[PDB]
């Protein structure tokens, strides 16, 4: 009834060019079985969206990586939000929502925008830069650790820790096992910065700890909620902004449209998140036997959702393989969908918007002028190196 495929969606060959294999996964059927890892897969928009929006049947508390927490110990204490189901999910989610709220965005927008403008000005003085290290990494590193309230010392641990976290959702391949081997100093740093005295007043971390007296969370929950922001809040935006610059570099017609109307910046970033899908995949675990797309899945089965594939499914999107900054992007699943839909999406969009605004106002051309190198991670899609020449407007 269900087609069986040998495609390994966590192989370097797949990461290097996932699009043919994603079409093979979509076209094989609404539900596939991946013999390499003994999991079900859904790669079409309809089934990915259905799975995301039924958290009772497709739960997160048995892990959103390949490992089933009912069968194996999690490599770190479970996240109180990502790896929780309702009702335990609900109040921690509400706290992070209020921490990363519209009012918070209003307090930080001017500073985030000034830092974006300053970075682009600095890069234009160099002309030839690496849009990963020098822009996609450098700009989030210049705003997000400060917005968290982190001290200066030890920030070099943040990107390695996040790469470890996203590799650890994967199967036990070499990427995952090497990440865990090297993890001890990054975990130690991160767990220490989650404690209330190490988070500067007014930042996101202090605000989480200040929410521990309302009856929503207790003091002993606040460090792991800070940990969620230090896990998910930096490396995602690095790959989101990197995706947007890579798109603008490959589609000069769209850079020209963005220059002519910088108010398209926010949608140009949203389209980059759909088009590249920095977070490629997440899993759920079935809590019962369930019929999905005419297939019957037993209880306690892992289901791999291909978010990037759903965002390119021609059953849902017209010309899905085109980067179009005026596309109606509403409904893409690059931030997820439903009760776990990215609680940091306003921070991500703020960063992406103000960076793309700075590019739109200051840069006339973005030309790849060196070898492009991909970065391999079991969950994140993005580049290691993106040499570009920036021509000033
Ligand atoms: C381009 C940037 C980003 C992308 C593509 C992205 C993607 C996602 C996705 C797909 C999910 C859903 C997970 C699931 O359904 O299991 C999610 C959830 C989440 N994200 Fe984001 N994210 C981004 C930025 C951020 C930022 C900046 C933060 C924090 C400041 C953050 C914190 C979180 C958290 C804490 C969750 C868990 C929410 C929940 O389980 O209720 N993310 N993200
Ligand atoms: C979306 C996401 C990614 C990585 C870690 C977390 C977390 O809650 O720790 C969330
Ligand atoms: Cl940790």
């Amino acid at each position: 009834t269900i087609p069986h495929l040998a495609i390994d969606p966590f192989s370097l060959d797949f990461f290097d060019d996932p699009y043919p294999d994603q079409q093979t996964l979509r076209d094989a059927g609404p539900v596939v079985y991946l013999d390499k890892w003994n999991v079900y897969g859904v790669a079409r928009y309809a089934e990915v969206h259905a799975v995301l929006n039924d958290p009772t049947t497709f739960c997160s508390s048995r892990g959103v990586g390949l490992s089933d927490f009912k069968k194996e110990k999690p490599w770190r204490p479970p996240s109180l939000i990502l790896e929780a189901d309702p009702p335990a999910h609900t109040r921690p989610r509400a706290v992070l929502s209020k921490v990363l709220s519209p009012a918070t965005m209003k307090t930080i927008r001017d500073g985030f925008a000034a830092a974006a403008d300053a970075k682009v000005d600095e890069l234009l003085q160099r002309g030839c830069i690496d849009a990963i290290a020098d822009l996609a990494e450098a700009y989030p590193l210049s705003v997000f650790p400060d917005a968290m309230g982190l001290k200066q010392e030890g920030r070099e641990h943040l990107l390695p820790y996040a790469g470890l976290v996203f590799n650890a959702f994967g199967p036990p391949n070499e990427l995952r096992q090497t990440a865990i081997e090297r993890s001890a100093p990054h975990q130690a740093y991160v767990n220490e910065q989650c404690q209330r005295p190490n988070l500067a007043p007014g930042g996101f971390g202090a605000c989480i700890h200040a929410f521990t007296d309302t009856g929503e969370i207790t003091p002993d929950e606040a460090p792991l909620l800070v940990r969620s922001l230090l896990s998910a809040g930096l490396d995602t935006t690095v790959n989101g902004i990197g995706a947007a610059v890579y798109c603008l570099a490959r589609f000069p017609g769209e850079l020209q449209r963005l220059r002519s109307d910088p108010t398209l910046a926010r949608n140009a970033f949203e389209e980059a998140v759909r088009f590249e899908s920095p977070v490629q995949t997440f899993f759920r675990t079935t809590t019962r036997e369930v019929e999905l797309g005419g297939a019957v899945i037993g209880e306690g089965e892992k289901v791999l959702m291909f978010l990037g594939s759903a965002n390119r499914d021609p059953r849902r999107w017209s010309d899905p393989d085109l980067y179009d900054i005026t596309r109606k992007t509403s409904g893409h699943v690059g931030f997820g969908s439903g009760v776990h839909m990215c609680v940091g999406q306003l921070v991500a969009r703020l960063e992406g918007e103000v960076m793309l605004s700075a590019l739109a106002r200051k840069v006339a051309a973005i030309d790849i002028d060196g070898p492009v190198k991909r970065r391999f991670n079991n969950t994140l899609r993005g580049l290691e190196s993106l040499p570009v020449k920036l021509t000033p407007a």
Side-chain angles (χ1 to χ4, degrees), residues 75-76 161 187 191 227:
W75 73 278
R76 61 177 189 165
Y161 182 77
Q187 305 187 252
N191 291 330
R227 195 193 69 175

Side-chain angles (χ1 to χ4, degrees), residues 76 79-83 165-166 169 224 227-229 231-232 236 279 282:
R76 61 177 189 165
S79 166
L80 297 182
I81 179 171
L82 180 76
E83 287 156 349
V165 172
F166 279 101
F169 299 119
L224 286 198
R227 195 193 69 175
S228 282
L229 299 196
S231 300
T236 51
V279 177
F282 267 127

Side-chain angles (χ1 to χ4, degrees), residues 224-238:
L224 286 198
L225 291 178
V226 180
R227 195 193 69 175
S228 282
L229 299 196
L230 297 181
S231 300
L234 181 69
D235 212 3
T236 51
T237 67
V238 169

Side-chain angles (χ1 to χ4, degrees), residues 3 9 17 49 121 139 174 240 248 338 349:
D17 179 16
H49 185 277
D121 283 338
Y139 170 69
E174 191 259 321
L248 291 164
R349 295 184 175 133

Side-chain angles (χ1 to χ4, degrees), residues 12 14 30 59 65 91 105 121 131 154 157 175 212 218 228 242 260:
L12 304 189
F14 183 99
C59 81
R91 276 183 286 179
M105 301 308 106
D121 283 338
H157 291 283
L175 280 167
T212 55
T218 55
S228 282
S260 80

